[PDB]
Design a protein around this ligand. Structure first.
Ligand SMILES: *[C@@H]1O[C@H](CO[C@@H]2O[C@@H](C)[C@@H](O)[C@@H](O)[C@@H]2O)[C@@H](O[C@@H]2O[C@H](CO)[C@@H](O)[C@H](O)[C@H]2NC(C)=O)[C@H](O)[C@H]1NC(C)=O
Ligand SMILES: *[C@@H]1O[C@H](CO)[C@@H](O)[C@H](O)[C@H]1NC(C)=O
Ligand SMILES: *[C@@H]1O[C@H](CO)[C@@H](O)[C@H](O)[C@H]1NC(C)=O
Ligand SMILES: CC[C@@H](C(N)=O)N1CCCC1=O
Lengths: 592, 420
């Protein structure tokens, strides 16, 4: 029984490879390459949106701690759910069908989140958008693989990873060109406000819609038709590839010589259909953990988890350390004035990064002043008057207020820590958040630039991988890039300034991309066509879970020491490379 | 049934009951100009009131039931010196035996002591961190009943607050002379107001307490926020009882302008002494007499008056166009001479049709004596705009719960101490 079915798969794979060789490489493959590249560009764009809009969304939504982190981590949870779901559904519904459904869901919920005003609703919309976009990479790679001959499969598949970097560059450029315009205050509904980061969200939701539009004009992969017992349309699609390729070549007169293709023999209503689909998907998932594929699946799990953990941890660690260094430099410049006695005189000023200690102000009226990181300590205010006071990161600690009036000020109760107020009046308090929300200004610009630089770092290695994939191999490229990633991880200690962090980020990003390409190609080539999307989606869900874990662990380690992130990244990458070196070789083989 | 009843008379205090209790008053005891029957006692030695009963009415028995009643006004406690500072205000204790009433920070205490030095205490507690208080610097009707067989109970404004058994207490003696002086107060600037002190030789039940409350409430006269009489030619801040976190404000002058409820209110804080809400916010409402023939400045029920409105220390008039869309039509503040025939006249209402005392309400009416309706607020596109409507009258006729037709007048008072 098993031998006959194995022989049938082998002969089907060999005839499919012969047909693909006869059709040849040409315009059809490049058209599908661009379409799936747009589909991958959508995924590449999706991972930057929350990180770029958080500085404005914290003030525009009164976002506290334990809410910014969940917003940052929600896209990966959504991706983890969606990757598994769509990878399971793609082996029973079709690669193109599930890709259209997932991309449409992502587009719809990304459009919905751009107008959402609340936080929990924003969390739900972003989680659903992550679910929609999670299934992009597995389906796209498994869909493009089934149109390539064995002569150049690593090269043509590794060329498909340029669009992820293109999407990252697009996101960085859009953030640089849209977000800094804080003046935009479009008003539709008095209770609601439309800022620039929502426009950025719209522009970042655009490429998924473009991907859907491009994908609507492509045909289903013939291999999925052949596996499911559908022979006529697989022949039609292969023929269409033939005419497109040879018409582009310049010989639109030859005939598709293939007549018959061997096909795998196939052996309340809504609930029954759902139960059948779930059972079949579970069967595919369990057969992924079968006697034939059990060493392979665990080794792939190890490699995916380790590389995802290290990569996402370091990628979230670099900007956090740049911010920490900037904060340390800012706190080093703080001015201190211990003690000052002030008599009747009006006060206007704008003070930044100052601490006034032991002040004694008698009958002082403070009119129209802006405070940024200004702290009054051990001060006494008597018969004072605060009018038109706007403050950020300003606190009154150990202060005593007597007969003072706070008119038209945003000095809320959380800004008086361990203070004593006697006979004081608060009148016409400005509208504001109940707690602190911090403030981000011009320093956003460089952030975009930094992101851009990181994405550009990817550009060289990709080329090299795409130009060398079939020359050395998937295993050797994967190992030789993971080893360099580990070396760059060790080299992290030799940097403590912002420029050093930027250079280190560029080095790591330019080094790890070849390993990621190799893992993608190897995962595509190591599974049968009736389990390719299921296995790829399960491994991608594992990748997203490792991304969550690594991001949390590496962000919890900022400002403490530079040894823990280095140790974690190096150990994980060494384990991943060691596990990857034990994988089988798939170069020079038919797509079985 | 009353043994002691101190009432004001021609420059003295006289006992209404047929006992002729001797009353002597110190040289620093004050009297309010409008309501001389209210007595002010300050924290001094000369600010004293002695009342001497007869030997035949001195409480010396031990099954004898008795009750007391009075009205008290206590200013706000401003600083920590008042904390843990229980001070006696009324004393009838001799040889460590009798009855007494005292005040502490947010507490009114009744104390009974017999010859065996056993103390029984009944306390009424009111907070000071509330946004708007029903007791701070406002008149409070306190009535205390003592049944030697069952219990001793205290009633604030006619409702029971606390009750404690006294069956264990033995024979209670009482002084021949009763005290009215602040005793034991460390605060040198603390005063009280008391009025309408009555004593009865039997335990009052809820019914007689309620009738005494209504009889002494003076239901036919309008009252301000502090419980004092409402007067003409005095600026009052306005408070809505249903929506007490917003104050009356104006934006433009004339018919094109409206007055609305703007919020939120401010706060006055003294770091765990009080966290009250600011009462001196908004626009002042002056009352001008129009048809009241009474010579006094006291605003009585059913008086037909005008309402001036203070905007940037300039006086305008309440008026509305009797003819516009809807029943709930906008009120406006406009120049005094340019009003013409717009509806000005406001009827002041304090008690309902049956005579039950309620808060201050205003009924706008036209020149023809047609009820435009009660004054309140209605929400137009998220703005609480002042409107006169007959919807409130319809609900009153149906005995339904009206929403916003009840107002409160807040004059500036020394017992509140807020900075304007
Ligand atoms: C807190 O204030 C009260 C009331 O004073 C008013 O409010 C102040 C904020 C300020 O604006 C004063 O000019 C106001 O008159 C104080 O209590 C009164 O203080 C005055 C002294 O000017 C005195 O004449 C009154 O008798 C006081 N009234 C009472 C009932 O004691 C209070 O002392 C202030 N607290 C402190 C700690 O000074
Ligand atoms: C602020 O105050 C200073 C002196 O206190 C004065 O010279 C200056 O003109 C003021 N600012 C403006 C804008 O007038
Ligand atoms: C500041 O705090 C210290 C203790 O934390 C206290 O001793 C000191 O009195 C405070 N400053 C003033 C002006 O009271
Ligand atoms: C499409 C590329 C994708 C992948 N799954 O290989 N990449 C590249 C860098 C990180 C990542 O998830």
């Amino acid at each position: 029984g098993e031998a006959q079915r194995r022989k049938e798969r082998e002969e089907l794979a060999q005839q499919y490879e012969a047909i693909l060789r006869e059709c040849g490489h040409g315009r059809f493959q490049w058209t599908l390459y661009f379409v799936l590249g747009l589909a991958l560009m959508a995924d590449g764009v999706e991972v930057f949106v929350v990180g770029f809009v958080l500085p404005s969304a914290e003030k525009d939504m009164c976002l506290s701690d334990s809410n910014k982190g969940m917003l940052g981590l929600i896209v990966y949870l959504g991706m983890m759910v969606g990757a598994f779901l769509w990878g399971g559904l793609a082996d029973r519904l079709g690669r193109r069908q599930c890709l259209l459904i997932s991309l449409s869901v992502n587009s719809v919920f990304a459009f919905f989140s751009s107008f959402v005003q609340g936080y929990g609703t924003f969390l739900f919309c972003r989680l659903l958008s992550g679910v929609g976009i999670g299934g992009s990479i597995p389906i796209v790679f498994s869909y493009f693989s089934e149109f390539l001959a064995q002569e150049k499969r690593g090269e043509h598949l590794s060329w498909l990873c340029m669009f992820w970097m293109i999407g990252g560059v697009y996101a960085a450029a859009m953030a640089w060109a849209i977000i800094p315009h804080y003046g935009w205050s479009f008003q539709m509904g008095s209770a609601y406000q439309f800022h620039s980061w929502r426009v950025f969200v719209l522009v970042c939701a655009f490429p998924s819609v473009f991907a859907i539009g491009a994908l609507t004009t492509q045909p289903e992969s013939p291999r999925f038709f052949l596996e499911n017992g559908k022979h006529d349309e697989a022949w039609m699609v292969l023929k269409q590839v033939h005419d497109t390729n040879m018409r582009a070549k310049g010989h639109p007169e030859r005939v598709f010589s293939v007549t018959h293709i061997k096909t795998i023999h196939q052996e309340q209503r809504w609930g029954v259909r759902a139960l059948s689909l779930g059972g079949q998907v579970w069967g595919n998932f369990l057969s992924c953990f079968g006697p034939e594929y059990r060493r392979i699946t665990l080794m792939m799990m190890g490699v995916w988890f380790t590389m995802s953990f290290s990569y996402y941890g370091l990628t979230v660690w670099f900007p956090d350390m740049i911010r920490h260094l900037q904060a340390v430099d800012y706190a080093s410049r703080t001015k201190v004035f211990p003690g000052e006695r002030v008599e009747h005189v009006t006060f206007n000023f704008t003070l930044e990064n100052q601490i006034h200690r032991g002040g004694q102000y008698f009958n002082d009226k403070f009119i129209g002043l802006r405070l940024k990181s200004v702290s009054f300590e051990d001060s006494l205010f008597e018969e004072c008057y605060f009018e038109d006071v706007t403050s950020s990161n300003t606190f009154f600690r150990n202060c005593t207020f007597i007969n003072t009036v706070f008119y038209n000020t945003d000095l809320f109760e959380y800004k008086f820590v361990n203070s004593r107020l006697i006979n004081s009046t608060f009148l016409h308090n400005k509208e504001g958040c109940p707690l602190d929300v911090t403030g981000t200004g011009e320093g956003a610009y460089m952030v975009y630039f930094v992101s851009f630089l990181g994405t550009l770092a990817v550009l060289p290695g990709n080329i090299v991988s795409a130009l060398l994939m079939d020359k050395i191999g998937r295993l050797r490229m994967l190992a030789g890039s993971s080893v360099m990633s580990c070396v760059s991880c060790f080299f992290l200690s030799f940097g403590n300034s912002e420029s050093a962090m930027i250079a280190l980020l560029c080095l790591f990003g330019g080094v790890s991309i070849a390993s990621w390409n190799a893992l993608d190609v190897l995962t595509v080539e190591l599974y049968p066509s009736d389990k390719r999307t299921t296995a790829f989606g399960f491994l991608n869900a594992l990748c997203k879970l490792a991304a969550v874990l690594g991001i949390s662990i590496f962000t919890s380690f900022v400002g403490i020491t530079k040894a823990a992130p280095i140790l974690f990244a190096s150990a994980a990458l060494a384990l991943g490379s060691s596990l990857a070196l034990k994988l089988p070789e798939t170069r020079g083989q038919v797509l079985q | 049934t009353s043994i002691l009843s101190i009432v004001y008379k021609k420059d003295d205090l006289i006992d209404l009951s047929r006992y002729g209790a001797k009353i002597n008053i110190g040289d620093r005891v004050y009297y309010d100009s409008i309501d001389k029957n209210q007595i002010k006692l300050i924290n001094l030695e000369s600010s004293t009131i002695e009342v001497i009963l007869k030997n035949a009415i001195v409480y010396n028995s031990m099954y004898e039931n008795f009750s007391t009643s009075f009205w008290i006004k206590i200013p706000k406690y401003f600083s920590k010196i008042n904390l843990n500072n229980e001070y006696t205000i009324i004393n009838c204790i001799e040889n460590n035996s009798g009855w007494k009433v005292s005040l502490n920070y947010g507490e009114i205490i009744w104390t009974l002591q017999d010859n065996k030095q056993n103390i029984q205490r009944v306390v009424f507690k009111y907070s000071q961190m509330v946004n708007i208080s029903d007791y701070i610097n406002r008149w409070i009707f306190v009535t205390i009943t003592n049944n030697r067989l069952t219990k001793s109970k205290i009633y604030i404004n006619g409702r029971l607050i606390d009750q404690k058994p006294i069956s264990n207490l033995g024979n209670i003696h009482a002084s021949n002379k009763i005290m009215f002086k602040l005793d034991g107060c460390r605060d040198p600037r603390r005063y009280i107001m008391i009025k309408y002190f009555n004593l009865f030789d039997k335990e009052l039940n809820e019914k007689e307490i309620k009738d005494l409350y209504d009889s002494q409430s003076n239901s036919g006269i309008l009252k301000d926020f502090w419980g004092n009489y409402l007067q003409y030619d005095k600026p009052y801040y306005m408070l809505n009882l249903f929506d007490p976190n917003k104050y009356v404000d104006v934006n433009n002058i004339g018919i094109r302008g409206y007055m609305y409820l703007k919020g939120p209110r401010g706060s006055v804080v003294t770091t765990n002494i009080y966290l009250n809400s600011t009462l001196y916010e908004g626009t002042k409402f002056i009352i001008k007499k129009y048809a009241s023939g009474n010579e006094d400045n006291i605003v009585r029920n059913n008086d037909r008056v005008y309402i001036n409105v203070v905007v940037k220390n300039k006086e305008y008039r309440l008026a509305t166009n009797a003819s516009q869309a809807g029943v709930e039509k906008i009120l406006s503040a406009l120049e005094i001479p340019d009003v013409g025939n717009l509806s000005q006249v406001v009827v002041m209402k304090s008690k309902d049709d049956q005579g039950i005392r309620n808060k201050c309400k205003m009924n706008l009416q036209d020149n023809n004596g047609n009820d435009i309706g009660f004054i309140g607020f209605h929400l137009y596109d998220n703005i609480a705009k002042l409107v006169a409507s007959n919807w409130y009258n319809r609900q009153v006729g149906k005995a339904s719960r009206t929403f916003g037709c009840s107002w409160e007048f807040i004059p500036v008072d020394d017992g509140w101490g807020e900075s304007s």
